[PDB]
Write an enzyme that holds these catalytic residues in place. Sequence first.
Site, PDB file in Angstrom:
ATOM      1  N   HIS A  79      16.875 -34.041  33.790  1.00 30.93           N
ATOM      2  CA  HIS A  79      18.224 -34.769  32.843  1.00 30.93           C
ATOM      3  C   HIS A  79      19.929 -34.847  34.093  1.00 30.93           C
ATOM      4  O   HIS A  79      20.266 -34.155  34.316  1.00 30.93           O
ATOM      5  CB  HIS A  79      18.785 -33.448  32.021  1.00 30.93           C
ATOM      6  N   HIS A  83      18.536 -40.499  34.877  1.00 31.75           N
ATOM      7  CA  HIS A  83      17.867 -40.438  33.395  1.00 31.75           C
ATOM      8  C   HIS A  83      19.045 -40.621  32.728  1.00 31.75           C
ATOM      9  O   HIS A  83      19.456 -41.987  32.284  1.00 31.75           O
ATOM     10  CB  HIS A  83      18.054 -38.778  33.590  1.00 31.75           C
ATOM     11  N   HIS A 117      26.805 -38.397  28.612  1.00 28.33           N
ATOM     12  CA  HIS A 117      25.643 -37.633  27.877  1.00 28.33           C
ATOM     13  C   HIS A 117      24.730 -36.491  27.894  1.00 28.33           C
ATOM     14  O   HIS A 117      24.794 -35.413  27.156  1.00 28.33           O
ATOM     15  CB  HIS A 117      24.752 -38.328  26.906  1.00 28.33           C
ATOM     16  N   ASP A 118      24.330 -35.783  29.082  1.00 29.26           N
ATOM     17  CA  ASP A 118      24.217 -35.142  30.012  1.00 29.26           C
ATOM     18  C   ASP A 118      24.435 -34.369  30.964  1.00 29.26           C
ATOM     19  O   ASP A 118      23.980 -33.693  31.966  1.00 29.26           O
ATOM     20  CB  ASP A 118      22.606 -35.412  30.229  1.00 29.26           C
ATOM     21  N   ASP A 228      18.508 -42.551  24.632  1.00 30.68           N
ATOM     22  CA  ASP A 228      17.607 -41.342  25.277  1.00 30.68           C
ATOM     23  C   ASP A 228      16.079 -41.107  25.661  1.00 30.68           C
ATOM     24  O   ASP A 228      15.435 -40.739  26.370  1.00 30.68           O
ATOM     25  CB  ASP A 228      18.314 -40.095  24.486  1.00 30.68           C
ATOM     26  N   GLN A 280       1.074 -35.338  23.943  1.00 33.96           N
ATOM     27  CA  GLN A 280       2.726 -36.547  23.570  1.00 33.96           C
ATOM     28  C   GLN A 280       2.392 -37.299  22.597  1.00 33.96           C
ATOM     29  O   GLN A 280       3.152 -38.343  22.012  1.00 33.96           O
ATOM     30  CB  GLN A 280       2.684 -37.160  25.065  1.00 33.96           C
TER      31      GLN A 280
HETATM   32 MG   LIG Z   1      20.267 -34.668  25.910  1.00 36.05          MG
HETATM   33 ZN   LIG Z   2      19.337 -37.507  27.391  1.00 32.46          ZN
END
Ligand SMILES: [Mg+2]
Ligand SMILES: [Zn+2]
EC number: 3.1.4.17
Length: 324
Positions: A79, A83, A117-118, A228, A280
């Site tokens: 993150h 990303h 967003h992160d 995302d 996964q």
């Molecule tokens: Mg996040």
């Molecule tokens: Zn993210």
Amino acid sequence: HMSICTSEEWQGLMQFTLPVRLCKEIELFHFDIGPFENMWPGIFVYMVHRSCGTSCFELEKLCRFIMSVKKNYRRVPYHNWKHAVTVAHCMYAILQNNHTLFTDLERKGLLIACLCHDLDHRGFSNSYLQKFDHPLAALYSTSTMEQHHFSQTVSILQLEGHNIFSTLSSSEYEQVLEIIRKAIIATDLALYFGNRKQLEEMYQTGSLNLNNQSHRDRVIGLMMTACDLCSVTKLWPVTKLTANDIYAEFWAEGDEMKKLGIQPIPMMDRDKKDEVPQGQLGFYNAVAIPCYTTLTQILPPTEPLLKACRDNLSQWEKVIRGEE
Ligand SMILES: [Mg+2]
Ligand SMILES: [Zn+2]
């Protein structure tokens, strides 16, 4: 509390020019920013200019904003800054293919929400924060990290010369902040399950209505999830390398949990890597595939994401069959 970029940093971005060859590649859904690290900030400027216009934002403020955002992402395995730009590029591709379905305010808000967003992610999940009563979990009872990411976003806009939205009318300014808040909160996967179920039902019964604000909010939320998780829509080698980073982060969290006397879930246990392929497969069947399936029904042009996700699901199945 926020780190601030240097003059050398944002001035350098202002002069950056994107190599001509990449202009064509960046429009594609499967584009991987990976081999162009020095160009990431410039790639974002390029996408904002193409989607929103070269004068949508004052260039100087936009460059300061971008470089300060980069400085507030931490050096965690997954993150991180890479990303953020990857997620923003997926949003760019979705918007370009469905341009007029969204307002100018929504496109600006969403590209920015994706980049932020992160923000300030520490490599720890909401599960961890809440299980161990981190101060953040007390402040933000649900969607803990996501409420934090939005708070960080507002903090950056408040830095001198960083408010790229100040030229919006007072009404549009409040509207864009709300678009951003809702978009960032939507990245909490806990909320995705209900959102997808609701959207699928609205779509199937024919009640989905894009002039209905609550419906628009939900579609935007699914777009956020789709962006995302887009590592699962890249070419297999890219998807596989990104999975390595995702687990490196999970394993570090699992290590801390053991120190506090709690056995981590298998996914976060570095001593249980043999369970990853099945894990996964489970994620693709329960999260990824349904997400892109519903997104494709609502926005037909996004079909390439679903096709790529299906191809990678098959790749994980090959791993399970021992054909790696
Ligand atoms: Mg996040
Ligand atoms: Zn993210």
